Amino acid sequence: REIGLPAQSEIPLLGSAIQCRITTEDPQNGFLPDTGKIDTYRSPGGFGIRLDVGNAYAGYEVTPYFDSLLVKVCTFANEFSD
Amino acid sequence: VVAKRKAETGNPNQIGATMPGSVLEILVKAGDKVQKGQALMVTEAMKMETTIEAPFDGEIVDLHVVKGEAIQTQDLLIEIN
């Protein structure tokens, strides 16, 4: 009535979506999270791209105190293959 | 406080410290021949241990750190030829 969601059978199902978490885990060093200053951070966009950024910006110092997430990337499209 | 020699940026003959910490153990000394992957020394960052491995086959030129020494990012640990 208020939030405006439809009934169950009318809940849309629009294509597909994939999410990856980009982290500072170094796959060549047993996925230990890297730390240090981010010199460069240039994030993509365009159609079918959603970014939910953590702490990643040019100048930011990744500390050892917290999780290693930099940015969540989602893509979406009509077809899974796209 | 005499500043420490830094590793040259983009010089693959020079291994610089990647994070601040200290030197626990040195396993080689000047002149030794060495193979890719071979352990050269051990360091710590927030009491987590890292082993420094040789980036490729070659001869050790020198050490630039001593046992228990403190180190900051970019500090030159060892030179290889």
Tell me whether residues A36 and B73 touch, CB distance under 8 A.
Answer: yes
Distances (CA, A) of A69 to A76, B27, B52: 21, 35, 26
Which method, experimentally, gave rise to this model? X-ray
Q: Measure the CA–CA gap between A67 and A69, rounded to whole angstroms.
A: 6
Q: Where are the beta strands (DSSP E) in chain B?
A: 14-16, 21-26, 33-34, 39-45, 48-53, 58-63, 70-71, 76-80
* Residue A30 forms contact with B (CB below 8 Å): no
For residue A46, the SS3 value is: coil
Q: Among all residues of chain A, which has the CA nearest to that of B17?
A: A36
Distance CA B28, CA A34 (A): 26
